[PDB]
Amino acid sequence: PSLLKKLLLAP
Amino acid sequence: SLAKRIYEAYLKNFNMNKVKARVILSGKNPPFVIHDMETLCMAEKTLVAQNKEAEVRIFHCCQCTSVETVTELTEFAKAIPGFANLDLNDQVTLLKYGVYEAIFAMLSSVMNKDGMLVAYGNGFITREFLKSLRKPFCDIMEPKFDFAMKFNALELDDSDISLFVAAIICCGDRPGLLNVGHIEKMQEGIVHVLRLHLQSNHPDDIFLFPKLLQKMADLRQLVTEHAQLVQIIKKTESDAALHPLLQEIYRDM
Ligand SMILES: CCc1cc(C(=O)O)c2c(C(CC)CC)nn(-c3ccc(F)cc3)c2n1
């Protein structure tokens, strides 16, 4: 995943 | 119910807002004023945990600020009803094109004609000192001050700004959006409650809403120009490394 995706996948 | 949930998400997620900024900018550990290089190093001694050029040091502190604001905006977006339901690639697209428009909108809250709050409210750097820097670092912040002076003349409060930022994020014409119809309907709801809120909150200014539509367009142009300065610095400045999150945002924008 991209860095933006990593932020969006956080709970 | 939409307006209240967005305002609460904004109060929950942004460490800095307009009420807190004005409370600090008026007194009531007052901000250390950075007006020259000697007060700069003094502030860095008291606040920051380099041997690089001061312009590169201010540059690296600004981008850390932006990285943290991007993280706050991401959490804020996830609290916008309907946002989490979108495809993940659509959420990425909205954030990618939306965060810097939101950032320069919200930056106005910490800006006045003389300068801006920095370092989570512990310092205040002067508009002139940023102009006194060497090119191209001197040309970064002045267009943002220009925007902020006109934006601040609208006298929005945090309740107005929270809905405005949600409208920026939930924008159906971003490049590459898959579910454009659903996002457009999301935006129509946000804009609807924003218009009702502006009428209730600013009955003295019946043209506030079209004024704000123009600010959304000015923001898009402000970010397009800013992205060009980012590329200049990425190519022609030695020690000005760019955070990987920010390079991902600017990449192909
Ligand atoms: C506080 C608001 C801000 C945001 C950015 C941003 O794009 O995230 C940025 C940048 C970028 C490159 C143009 C990447 C860091 N540079 N500056 C900047 C640098 C030195 C100064 F003296 C004044 C402003 C910046 N400020």
GROMACS .gro file of C-alpha atoms and ligand atoms in nm:
model
  290
    1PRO     CA    1   0.000   0.000   0.000
    2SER     CA    2   0.095   0.365  -0.048
    3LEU     CA    3   0.163   0.595   0.247
    4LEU     CA    4  -0.174   0.765   0.197
    5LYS     CA    5  -0.335   0.420   0.197
    6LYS     CA    6  -0.156   0.331   0.522
    7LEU     CA    7  -0.300   0.638   0.694
    8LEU     CA    8  -0.648   0.557   0.563
    9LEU     CA    9  -0.632   0.194   0.680
   10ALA     CA   10  -0.555   0.285   1.042
   11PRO     CA   11  -0.832   0.216   1.300
   12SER     CA   12  -2.723   1.637   1.206
   13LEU     CA   13  -2.455   1.657   0.935
   14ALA     CA   14  -2.325   2.000   1.038
   15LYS     CA   15  -2.279   1.901   1.402
   16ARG     CA   16  -2.091   1.579   1.324
   17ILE     CA   17  -1.848   1.760   1.095
   18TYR     CA   18  -1.781   2.041   1.346
   19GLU     CA   19  -1.718   1.780   1.616
   20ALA     CA   20  -1.481   1.583   1.391
   21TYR     CA   21  -1.291   1.909   1.332
   22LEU     CA   22  -1.270   1.988   1.703
   23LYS     CA   23  -1.157   1.631   1.776
   24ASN     CA   24  -0.888   1.603   1.511
   25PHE     CA   25  -0.706   1.936   1.460
   26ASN     CA   26  -0.455   2.027   1.732
   27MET     CA   27  -0.480   2.387   1.612
   28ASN     CA   28  -0.790   2.591   1.531
   29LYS     CA   29  -0.899   2.953   1.504
   30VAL     CA   30  -1.030   2.998   1.860
   31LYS     CA   31  -0.709   2.857   2.007
   32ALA     CA   32  -0.496   3.062   1.766
   33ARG     CA   33  -0.658   3.392   1.858
   34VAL     CA   34  -0.637   3.303   2.229
   35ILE     CA   35  -0.261   3.254   2.187
   36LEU     CA   36  -0.205   3.548   1.950
   37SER     CA   37  -0.359   3.778   2.215
   38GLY     CA   38  -0.177   3.653   2.527
   39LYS     CA   39  -0.343   3.483   2.826
   40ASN     CA   40   0.421   3.118   2.794
   41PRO     CA   41   0.350   3.379   2.524
   42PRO     CA   42   0.477   3.303   2.174
   43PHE     CA   43   0.846   3.353   2.106
   44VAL     CA   44   0.882   3.595   1.815
   45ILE     CA   45   1.114   3.490   1.532
   46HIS     CA   46   1.199   3.810   1.341
   47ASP     CA   47   1.565   3.752   1.250
   48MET     CA   48   1.820   3.472   1.228
   49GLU     CA   49   1.937   3.528   1.585
   50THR     CA   50   1.585   3.484   1.722
   51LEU     CA   51   1.549   3.187   1.486
   52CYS     CA   52   1.846   2.999   1.632
   53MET     CA   53   1.733   3.102   1.980
   54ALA     CA   54   1.389   2.951   1.915
   55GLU     CA   55   1.545   2.637   1.766
   56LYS     CA   56   1.762   2.599   2.077
   57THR     CA   57   1.457   2.616   2.306
   58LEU     CA   58   1.212   2.413   2.093
   59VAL     CA   59   1.371   2.183   1.833
   60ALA     CA   60   1.566   1.870   1.926
   61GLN     CA   61   2.114   2.131   1.252
   62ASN     CA   62   2.423   2.242   1.059
   63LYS     CA   63   2.220   2.291   0.739
   64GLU     CA   64   2.121   2.629   0.599
   65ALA     CA   65   1.848   2.804   0.798
   66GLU     CA   66   1.620   2.812   0.493
   67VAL     CA   67   1.651   2.433   0.475
   68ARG     CA   68   1.576   2.414   0.848
   69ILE     CA   69   1.259   2.624   0.821
   70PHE     CA   70   1.174   2.411   0.517
   71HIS     CA   71   1.202   2.083   0.709
   72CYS     CA   72   0.998   2.217   1.001
   73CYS     CA   73   0.720   2.333   0.768
   74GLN     CA   74   0.691   1.993   0.599
   75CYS     CA   75   0.676   1.811   0.932
   76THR     CA   76   0.391   2.048   1.016
   77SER     CA   77   0.226   1.953   0.687
   78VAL     CA   78   0.276   1.579   0.741
   79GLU     CA   79   0.105   1.608   1.080
   80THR     CA   80  -0.179   1.814   0.932
   81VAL     CA   81  -0.224   1.557   0.655
   82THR     CA   82  -0.259   1.293   0.926
   83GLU     CA   83  -0.518   1.507   1.105
   84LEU     CA   84  -0.708   1.567   0.779
   85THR     CA   85  -0.714   1.192   0.707
   86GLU     CA   86  -0.877   1.118   1.043
   87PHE     CA   87  -1.109   1.414   0.988
   88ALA     CA   88  -1.215   1.283   0.645
   89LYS     CA   89  -1.286   0.937   0.787
   90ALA     CA   90  -1.535   1.100   1.025
   91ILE     CA   91  -1.724   1.265   0.736
   92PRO     CA   92  -2.042   1.054   0.695
   93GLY     CA   93  -2.013   0.853   0.375
   94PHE     CA   94  -1.638   0.897   0.324
   95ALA     CA   95  -1.533   0.560   0.469
   96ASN     CA   96  -1.786   0.384   0.243
   97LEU     CA   97  -1.604   0.493  -0.072
   98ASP     CA   98  -1.356   0.269  -0.247
   99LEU     CA   99  -1.012   0.303  -0.089
  100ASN     CA  100  -0.864   0.441  -0.411
  101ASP     CA  101  -1.137   0.707  -0.412
  102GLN     CA  102  -1.053   0.810  -0.054
  103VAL     CA  103  -0.685   0.834  -0.153
  104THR     CA  104  -0.772   1.051  -0.454
  105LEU     CA  105  -0.988   1.288  -0.248
  106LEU     CA  106  -0.715   1.330   0.014
  107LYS     CA  107  -0.439   1.361  -0.247
  108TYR     CA  108  -0.601   1.659  -0.418
  109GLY     CA  109  -0.779   1.800  -0.114
  110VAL     CA  110  -0.529   1.821   0.171
  111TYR     CA  111  -0.325   2.119   0.056
  112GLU     CA  112  -0.636   2.320  -0.029
  113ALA     CA  113  -0.756   2.247   0.325
  114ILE     CA  114  -0.410   2.318   0.468
  115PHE     CA  115  -0.380   2.666   0.319
  116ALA     CA  116  -0.741   2.740   0.414
  117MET     CA  117  -0.678   2.639   0.776
  118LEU     CA  118  -0.336   2.807   0.780
  119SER     CA  119  -0.518   3.141   0.753
  120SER     CA  120  -0.643   3.078   1.109
  121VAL     CA  121  -0.289   3.113   1.250
  122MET     CA  122  -0.195   3.409   1.026
  123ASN     CA  123  -0.231   3.781   1.065
  124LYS     CA  124  -0.075   4.069   0.868
  125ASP     CA  125   0.251   4.047   1.067
  126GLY     CA  126   0.322   3.673   1.066
  127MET     CA  127   0.203   3.330   1.175
  128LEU     CA  128   0.205   3.093   1.471
  129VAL     CA  129   0.452   2.804   1.446
  130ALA     CA  130   0.568   2.509   1.656
  131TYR     CA  131   0.226   2.410   1.791
  132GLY     CA  132   0.165   2.764   1.916
  133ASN     CA  133   0.500   2.815   2.093
  134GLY     CA  134   0.652   3.050   1.834
  135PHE     CA  135   0.553   3.333   1.598
  136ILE     CA  136   0.760   3.400   1.285
  137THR     CA  137   0.726   3.737   1.110
  138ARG     CA  138   0.606   3.788   0.754
  139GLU     CA  139   0.912   4.004   0.680
  140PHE     CA  140   1.167   3.749   0.803
  141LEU     CA  141   1.025   3.492   0.561
  142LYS     CA  142   1.056   3.751   0.284
  143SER     CA  143   1.416   3.825   0.387
  144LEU     CA  144   1.523   3.467   0.313
  145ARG     CA  145   1.712   3.374  -0.002
  146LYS     CA  146   1.527   3.260  -0.312
  147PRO     CA  147   1.333   3.047  -0.368
  148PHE     CA  148   1.242   3.002   0.000
  149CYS     CA  149   1.137   3.369   0.024
  150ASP     CA  150   0.864   3.319  -0.236
  151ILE     CA  151   0.681   3.026  -0.072
  152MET     CA  152   0.476   3.185   0.205
  153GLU     CA  153   0.384   3.527   0.063
  154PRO     CA  154   0.099   3.402  -0.164
  155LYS     CA  155  -0.040   3.217   0.139
  156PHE     CA  156  -0.035   3.537   0.345
  157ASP     CA  157  -0.209   3.716   0.055
  158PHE     CA  158  -0.480   3.449   0.043
  159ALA     CA  159  -0.519   3.447   0.423
  160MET     CA  160  -0.568   3.823   0.455
  161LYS     CA  161  -0.860   3.809   0.210
  162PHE     CA  162  -0.990   3.483   0.362
  163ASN     CA  163  -0.971   3.621   0.717
  164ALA     CA  164  -1.162   3.931   0.606
  165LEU     CA  165  -1.464   3.699   0.571
  166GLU     CA  166  -1.446   3.650   0.951
  167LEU     CA  167  -1.537   3.281   0.951
  168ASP     CA  168  -1.530   3.086   1.276
  169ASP     CA  169  -1.436   2.724   1.334
  170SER     CA  170  -1.793   2.606   1.272
  171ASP     CA  171  -1.786   2.768   0.925
  172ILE     CA  172  -1.432   2.647   0.851
  173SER     CA  173  -1.511   2.287   0.947
  174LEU     CA  174  -1.791   2.266   0.688
  175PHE     CA  175  -1.580   2.447   0.427
  176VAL     CA  176  -1.292   2.200   0.469
  177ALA     CA  177  -1.536   1.908   0.437
  178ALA     CA  178  -1.661   2.057   0.108
  179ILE     CA  179  -1.300   2.084  -0.016
  180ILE     CA  180  -1.231   1.718   0.063
  181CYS     CA  181  -1.559   1.585  -0.078
  182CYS     CA  182  -1.504   1.717  -0.429
  183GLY     CA  183  -1.642   1.516  -0.720
  184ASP     CA  184  -1.422   1.657  -0.999
  185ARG     CA  185  -1.085   1.535  -0.871
  186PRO     CA  186  -0.882   1.353  -1.139
  187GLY     CA  187  -0.923   0.976  -1.139
  188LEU     CA  188  -1.233   0.949  -0.921
  189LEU     CA  189  -1.426   0.626  -0.977
  190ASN     CA  190  -1.755   0.683  -0.792
  191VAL     CA  191  -1.814   1.038  -0.910
  192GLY     CA  192  -2.192   1.023  -0.870
  193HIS     CA  193  -2.184   0.918  -0.505
  194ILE     CA  194  -1.917   1.175  -0.419
  195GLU     CA  195  -2.106   1.454  -0.598
  196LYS     CA  196  -2.413   1.371  -0.388
  197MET     CA  197  -2.197   1.373  -0.074
  198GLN     CA  198  -2.071   1.720  -0.170
  199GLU     CA  199  -2.422   1.844  -0.243
  200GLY     CA  200  -2.528   1.752   0.109
  201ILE     CA  201  -2.224   1.919   0.265
  202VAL     CA  202  -2.270   2.233   0.057
  203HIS     CA  203  -2.641   2.238   0.141
  204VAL     CA  204  -2.574   2.235   0.516
  205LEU     CA  205  -2.289   2.482   0.465
  206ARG     CA  206  -2.526   2.727   0.295
  207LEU     CA  207  -2.787   2.691   0.570
  208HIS     CA  208  -2.513   2.739   0.828
  209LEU     CA  209  -2.379   3.052   0.660
  210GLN     CA  210  -2.728   3.203   0.655
  211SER     CA  211  -2.785   3.128   1.026
  212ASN     CA  212  -2.432   3.221   1.133
  213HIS     CA  213  -2.369   3.525   0.907
  214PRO     CA  214  -2.710   3.687   0.845
  215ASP     CA  215  -2.527   4.018   0.787
  216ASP     CA  216  -2.351   3.885   0.472
  217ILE     CA  217  -2.606   3.742   0.228
  218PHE     CA  218  -2.335   3.695  -0.037
  219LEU     CA  219  -2.095   3.500   0.186
  220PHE     CA  220  -2.158   3.171   0.004
  221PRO     CA  221  -2.056   3.278  -0.351
  222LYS     CA  222  -1.757   3.455  -0.194
  223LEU     CA  223  -1.657   3.118  -0.047
  224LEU     CA  224  -1.704   2.938  -0.381
  225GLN     CA  225  -1.448   3.181  -0.526
  226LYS     CA  226  -1.213   3.099  -0.238
  227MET     CA  227  -1.233   2.731  -0.332
  228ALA     CA  228  -1.117   2.819  -0.684
  229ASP     CA  229  -0.843   3.052  -0.559
  230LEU     CA  230  -0.722   2.768  -0.335
  231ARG     CA  231  -0.694   2.528  -0.628
  232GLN     CA  232  -0.478   2.784  -0.811
  233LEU     CA  233  -0.273   2.853  -0.497
  234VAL     CA  234  -0.193   2.483  -0.464
  235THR     CA  235  -0.113   2.441  -0.835
  236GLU     CA  236   0.147   2.717  -0.810
  237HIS     CA  237   0.281   2.577  -0.481
  238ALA     CA  238   0.335   2.235  -0.640
  239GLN     CA  239   0.560   2.405  -0.896
  240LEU     CA  240   0.779   2.548  -0.620
  241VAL     CA  241   0.796   2.201  -0.463
  242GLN     CA  242   0.936   2.064  -0.791
  243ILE     CA  243   1.188   2.349  -0.819
  244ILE     CA  244   1.319   2.267  -0.471
  245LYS     CA  245   1.319   1.890  -0.535
  246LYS     CA  246   1.544   1.949  -0.840
  247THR     CA  247   1.770   2.245  -0.761
  248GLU     CA  248   1.826   2.254  -0.382
  249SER     CA  249   2.092   2.031  -0.226
  250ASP     CA  250   1.990   1.958   0.132
  251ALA     CA  251   1.612   2.007   0.090
  252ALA     CA  252   1.496   1.646   0.103
  253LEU     CA  253   1.121   1.595   0.079
  254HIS     CA  254   0.915   1.376   0.309
  255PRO     CA  255   0.797   1.059   0.127
  256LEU     CA  256   0.434   1.119   0.221
  257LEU     CA  257   0.444   1.467   0.069
  258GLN     CA  258   0.624   1.352  -0.244
  259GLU     CA  259   0.350   1.091  -0.286
  260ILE     CA  260   0.085   1.365  -0.261
  261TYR     CA  261   0.257   1.597  -0.509
  262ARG     CA  262   0.349   1.311  -0.747
  263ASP     CA  263   0.148   1.341  -1.071
  264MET     CA  264  -0.049   1.643  -0.947
  265LIG     C1  265   0.389   2.613   0.691
  265LIG     C2  266   0.324   2.584   0.555
  265LIG     C3  267   0.421   2.516   0.445
  265LIG     C4  268   0.382   2.398   0.373
  265LIG     C5  269   0.468   2.340   0.276
  265LIG     C6  270   0.423   2.205   0.199
  265LIG     O1  271   0.424   2.205   0.077
  265LIG     O2  272   0.395   2.109   0.272
  265LIG     C7  273   0.595   2.400   0.251
  265LIG     C8  274   0.711   2.375   0.164
  265LIG     C9  275   0.727   2.258   0.059
  265LIG    C10  276   0.818   2.296  -0.064
  265LIG    C11  277   0.778   2.428  -0.134
  265LIG    C12  278   0.772   2.126   0.123
  265LIG    C13  279   0.825   2.150   0.263
  265LIG     N1  280   0.804   2.471   0.186
  265LIG     N2  281   0.761   2.565   0.282
  265LIG    C14  282   0.847   2.680   0.332
  265LIG    C15  283   0.989   2.663   0.344
  265LIG    C16  284   1.078   2.762   0.392
  265LIG    C17  285   1.024   2.883   0.435
  265LIG     F1  286   1.107   2.979   0.482
  265LIG    C18  287   0.885   2.908   0.430
  265LIG    C19  288   0.798   2.806   0.380
  265LIG    C20  289   0.629   2.519   0.326
  265LIG     N3  290   0.543   2.574   0.420
   0.00000   0.00000   0.00000
